[PDB]
Amino acid sequence: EVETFAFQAEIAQLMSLIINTFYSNKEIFLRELISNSSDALDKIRYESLTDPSKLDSGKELHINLIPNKQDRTLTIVDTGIGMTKADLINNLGTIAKSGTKAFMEALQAGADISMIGQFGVGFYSAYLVAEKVTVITKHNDDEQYAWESSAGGSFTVRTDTGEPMGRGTKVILHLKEDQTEYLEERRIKEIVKKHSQFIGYPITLFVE
């Protein structure tokens, strides 16, 4: 049922850096996840321009933000292109090894952690606020999979038998105990407005 994988050394080192570096501007995680959702949405949209059947798995292109205070989770769901199992395993479709190298060189020439998305690894910013991250994805060419990691060097992949998603990627942030501010409606709204206000797809903030 469950396969366990080692992170490549460079990715593990990125995640340690994210987890251990003192850095108060944690809110940028959400901008970086919304940006990835936006890029995935652009991708399925571009494919659909020449093959409309690519949208048979769902026509609507959007991003939902779902806080759950009982589970202590913030969920970001998109209806983008999704990821195959292989892309999930290969660093959630990122150029993580080369991007980590470039990010860490940038960090020695004055950059700060908020600039992580310039290096193609903004996904890992989830670890600013989450103790555990679960990613459920469905790409038209593959089955639905669940990836999971509490960092510490490893991640799991399994076929997901949860709710079918049709197509796209869902990122479930199991928040650290001291980061529950990111479940408050007014805080989420503030961050969306500050950093994600011109995103080209509707962003719906669910209420509880």
Ligand SMILES: CCNC(=O)CN(C(=O)c1ccc(O)cc1O)c1ccc(OC)cc1
């Ligand atoms: C690049 C083409 N492939 C996808 O578009 C799949 N894509 C996702 O499915 C995805 C991944 C992470 C995420 O938080 C949200 C998402 O929709 C993805 C988006 C960005 C990315 O690096 C910037 C890597 C993968």
